[PDB]
Design a protein around this nucleic acid. Structure first.
Length: 196
DNA sequence: TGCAAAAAACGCATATTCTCTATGCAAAAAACGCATTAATACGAGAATTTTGTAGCTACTTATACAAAATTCAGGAAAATTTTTCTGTATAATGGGAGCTGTCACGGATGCA
């Protein structure tokens, strides 16, 4: 079942990602692209949604122009336009799910979309951490734990910080012990805290 | 089977007369004018007022030292398999396997 780790290349320029990526699990992201570039988690998929997104544009040869990779050993299918094909033509069985797919990944980002559009990025970080680091693990070191080990330059890549939102922002959070270098727990003791 | 010929029909004498072509009536449409009212637009007033421009200020980042806390490449033991070397003590005493049906040529020797 289609199952992808980090440090990869999943979409490309031009992809045929039509026949389903069919993402089932990750805790992770659609990096996108286009020309100016920014292959950013310009969407996401954790466990519980599914691709089939620009794969369902003009379809198997649209102008499919993204590129994504994980940090999770993503989980995602072993079939072609069949399980979807049911889902597409023969009914709304997983047709509503097809629509849901967009409303479960595009619209998922849509929320982060009206929120990533803020001045300081710390907000986007706190939001992101409010949903993920908190929930699907236990708020360990100093509170709503980073729910994994990543990097302090994570922000430096997530949003593309320039060794600036790093040590400075970290500094602030080091001052309010809402951080934990150890196993990258880095976090407020309480979810509401930085969520204000 | 030639007509001469008669009576009734079928053709030159008008009543009838009745579709017929022909003007004045009349009734209600219509449209034109008296026109009235109201509404569509001009005049003034000062009110909001957004945009356009300056300086201050907060965020954001350009950059210069380097061993962060972690990755990796050899170095040198084992660990087990495998490899090479050395050794095991009655008697044992000359080796099989086809060539024998090709025609013709060119030296090269042996053999009296």
């Amino acid at each position: 079942v289609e199952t992808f780790e980090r440090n990869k290349t999943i979409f490309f320029p031009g992809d045929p990602a039509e026949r389903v990526y069919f993402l089932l699990k990750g805790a992770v992201k659609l990096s996108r692209v286009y020309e100016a570039g920014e292959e950013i988690t310009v969407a996401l998929l954790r466990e519980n949604s599914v691709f089939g997104v620009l794969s369902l544009l003009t379809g198997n040869k649209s102008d499919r122009f993204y590129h994504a990779v994980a940090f999770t050993p993503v989980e995602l299918l072993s079939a072609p336009i069949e399980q979807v094909e049911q889902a597409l033509k023969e009914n709304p069985e997983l047709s509503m799910l097809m629509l849901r797919g967009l409303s479960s990944r595009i619209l998922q980002t849509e929320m982060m979309i009206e929120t990533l559009a803020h001045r300081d990025m710390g907000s986007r970080l706190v939001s992101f951490l409010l949903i993920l680091c908190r929930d699907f693990g236990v708020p360990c070191a100093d509170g709503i734990t980073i729910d994994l080990k990543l990097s302090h330059q994570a922000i430096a890549e997530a949003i593309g910080s320039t060794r600036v939102t790093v040590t400075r922002l970290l500094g602030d959070l080091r001052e309010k012990k809402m951080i934990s270098i150890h196993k990258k727990k880095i976090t407020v003791h309480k979810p509401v805290t930085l969520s204000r």
